[PDB]
Symmetry: C2
Subunit: 297 residues, 2 copies
């Protein structure tokens, strides 16, 4: 049914106190954890991970609740799907592999986990790359008509259950494909490997998975924002060297010039636009992989 898009990568079920993290593991060298985002799974890295795996031990993990990772029971505060909790869970996952100090690149929701990880537990990270995000606080702070329309899903998926769940159930295949297409530069699915789209489609076809994603966005509207707010107000800066990459046609470039933004959040950040929409590792895999190898090595 589902293609193995990481030939030569192992498949690891990593136990944590909140459930298993699924990961493809390949390469040797310094550990590098890659976190996908919405509405994707770890397979979104399938075009860049082998290039990284030439120099790193590449752990391509499904976020908690996403893909084949277990889905911790949520609660009224969406706690396990807050980026703080996912970061803690991924730290615990990496510790199971003996990686207490690792490189981390995240895209989309995974990048939100990543920078929250960097804020909460900066000692865990050698270097951080975030792909096509600004901090969640910044999206919400920038919230206006234009951004509301553009990232409407931030407020739609954060509606109380079961409203988005029921609506997403109305046409899940359409919805996941629409998100994938609409955030690319092409506007269609041609930038993706069909076998990868199949992964995303099958994950999205599971109502429980969709519920988790809504939990993630609910956390994104509530606790994640509050956690970020604390850092902005404390002036807490990420001290880990970081790379901010963004799609010239991506989500982050609209709200505010991402490097300028991330510079408010990180003491040591470099940035570059990648000629792509949101899905940098799939729309622009060579460019993305090059940037990441250059930065991480």
């Amino acid at each position: 049914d589902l293609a193995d898009l990481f030939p030569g990568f192992g498949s690891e079920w990593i136990n944590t106190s909140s459930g298993r993290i699924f990961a493809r593991v390949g390469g040797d060298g310094p550990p590098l954890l890659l976190l996908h985002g919405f509405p994707q799974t770890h397979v979104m890295w399938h075009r860049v991970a082998p290039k990284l795996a030439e120099r790193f031990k590449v752990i391509v993990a499904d976020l908690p609740g996403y893909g084949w990772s277990d889905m911790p029971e949520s609660d009224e505060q969406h706690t396990p799907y807050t980026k703080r909790a996912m970061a803690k869970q991924l730290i615990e996952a990496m510790e199971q592999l003996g990686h207490v100090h690792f490189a981390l690149a995240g895209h989309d929701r995974g990048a939100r986990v990543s920078y929250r990880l960097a804020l909460d537990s900066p000692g865990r990270l050698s270097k951080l790359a975030v792909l096509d995000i600004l901090p969640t606080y910044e999206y919400w702070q920038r919230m206006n008509r234009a951004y509301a329309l553009k990232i409407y899903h931030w407020s739609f998926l954060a509606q109380p259950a079961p409203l988005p769940e029921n609506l997403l159930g109305g046409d899940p295949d359409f919805y996941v494909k629409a998100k994938l297409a609409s955030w690319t530069r092409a506007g269609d699915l041609s930038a993706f490997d069909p076998r990868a789209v199949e992964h995303y489609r099958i994950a999205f076809a599971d109502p429980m998975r969709r519920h988790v994603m809504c939990e993630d966005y609910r956390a994104g509207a509530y606790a994640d924002f509050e956690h970020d707010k604390i850092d902005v107000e404390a002036g807490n800066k990420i001290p880990v060297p970081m790379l901010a990459l963004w799609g010239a046609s991506g989500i982050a470039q609209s709200a505010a010039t991402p490097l300028d933004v991330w510079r408010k959040w990180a003491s040591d950040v470099q940035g570059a636009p990648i000629e792509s929409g949101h899905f940098l590792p799939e729309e622009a895999p060579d460019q993305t992989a090059e940037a990441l190898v250059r930065f991480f090595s």
Copy 2:
């Protein structure tokens, strides 16, 4: 479907953009009542009889809603802009010989109404708007909190067929969700079940759903643009106007409603009513009294 306007006639009013359905009852000065989303003219069924004691009450389905015809939309959502709807309702009233009339609108209908009053103030003797602020003001107040409260403004404005496709899986759920969510009580108890059935049946038609999305698309784009021009040009509604809003309704979450309306209207009085959004159904007596009082001098 129940007749909720005993003794009211039924008019199909031809206009250049399609027929307007209306119930017509009473005698006296003409008073046009316009409903909003996701409702039809029947939302007035608790207040129209009281109004019909004093006015010729025309209870119209908005263009595209209820039993009114649905003009085909276009890429700018033109027929569902409030400007176009207002012109179409002016034409409808002219068909009845009403070239100068009182107007009370709720929700989208209220947006038609204030746009009517900006565009064609000579058509109105007095204007009442229920539980809205101008579209511009909602968008201008679109921060995190408000983006979450009226997420549907940005969700339903997403390009077709995204909201249509999600709404089609279980239309009943969404219409009942919206009816319930915007009431004070948070359920359907405020509504006459016969009225709910009207709303549900209207919502069950995919074309009607599409029109509603077109309305919201217009609300995100052209309506906003039209408003923006007026507010930036300092154009104010010169028609004496009543702004009623629900203490627990939508308008008051964005801002203090009379303060906002005083920026849009030279002659505005306002009162809150203990109600959620659906003033004529949640608080019919209070609504009906406020409207009778206002339109009666």
